[PDB]
């Protein structure tokens, strides 16, 4: 059909392609509205599932929480198409889907993404109003209830890392928290950002060792090796705090502190040559290699089931 996966797209085009995927594979993929943004845009996920069990284990794949990181939403929509294309053509994704559901949120910050397309390509935050300030938006990746208002966040609404007035104040973050909590039985939570070529695990808010650190590091290293096998792209691996910087209130620390074992952040390409402004001709190569990383992690979840 008429969607170029090697180009960047509007929010409406992305949502339309999600609907197309659900319509073309209605026994595998369903589009679910999980909430809405500050400006009342819908938040949509695709759920990929093969079983009508109750309480089937699930993994959550998150992208585009920071609106300027365009390679994340582009990689996510490509991933949606890859899952449906390869089902019953690749035993790896087929057996993953055999054992677990996958939820994919390609645009976790729709208002910010529209703003980057129409007003300021470098916008990061949400677009919520801050009473008492003319500064707009909170950093949705400092807004989660995991050492909220700790290190690496700001109390200042004008900051790129403003945490918001309280945990879950951003309706885009509350929507995901609420859906995961009600749905239950999550085993993985993977957040796609850019850039730096890093695959990280908890914690961002403290230097303390996650109980599962040895396993998470082992799985991240295998995933990085799989990712590098496609075109040679090298990733560094480690806990967020020392691998990028301290950051409190982040999505993967909230997921892990809530019992979701396989909690990882990818910082996708590149290492700073183009930074957030990654050329469209790198979308498909990035998404192809990232897929082997995501598959490796999900294979590990599968093999624990």
């Amino acid at each position: 059909n008429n969607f170029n996966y090697g180009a960047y797209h509007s929010l409406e085009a992305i949502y339309h392609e999600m609907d197309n995927i659900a319509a073309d594979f209605p026994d595998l993929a369903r589009r679910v509205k999980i909430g809405h943004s500050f400006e009342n845009r819908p938040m949509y996920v695709l759920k990929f599932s093969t079983g009508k069990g109750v309480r089937r284990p699930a993994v959550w794949l998150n992208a585009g929480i920071h609106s300027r990181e365009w390679i994340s939403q582009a990689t996510a929509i490509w991933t949606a198409r890859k899952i449906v294309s390869d089902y019953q053509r690749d035993p790896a994704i087929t057996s993953i889907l055999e054992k677990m559901d996958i939820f994919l949120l390609p645009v976790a910050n729709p208002d910010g993404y529209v703003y980057t397309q129409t007003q300021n390509r470098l916008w990061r935050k949400t677009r919520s109003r801050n009473p008492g300030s003319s500064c707009i938006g909170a950093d949705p990746n400092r807004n989660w209830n995991a050492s909220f208002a700790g290190k690496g966040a700001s109390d200042n609404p004008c900051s790129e890392v403003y945490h918001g007035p309280h945990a879950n104040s951003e309706v885009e973050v509350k929507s995901v928290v609420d859906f995961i909590q009600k749905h239950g039985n999550f085993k993985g939570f993977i957040d796609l950002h850019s850039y730096s070529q890093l695959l990280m695990y908890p914690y961002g808010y403290s230097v303390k060792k996650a109980p599962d650190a040895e396993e998470l590091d082992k799985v991240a290293r295998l995933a990085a090796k799989a990712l590098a096998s496609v075109s040679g792209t090298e990733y560094q691996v480690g806990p967020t705090c020392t691998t990028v910087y301290p950051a409190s209130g982040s999505s993967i620390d909230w997921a892990y502190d809530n019992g979701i074992k396989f909690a990882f952040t990818f910082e996708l390409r590149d290492t700073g040559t183009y930074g957030f402004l990654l050329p469209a001709n790198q979308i498909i190569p990035t998404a192809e290699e990232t897929w082997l990383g995501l598959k490796t992690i999900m294979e590990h979840v599968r093999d624990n089931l």
Binding site: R124, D139, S194, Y195, S196
Partner: peptide, 5 residues
């Protein structure tokens, strides 16, 4: 880098 990622 000079801005958060």
């Amino acid at each position: 880098f000079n801005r958060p990622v």
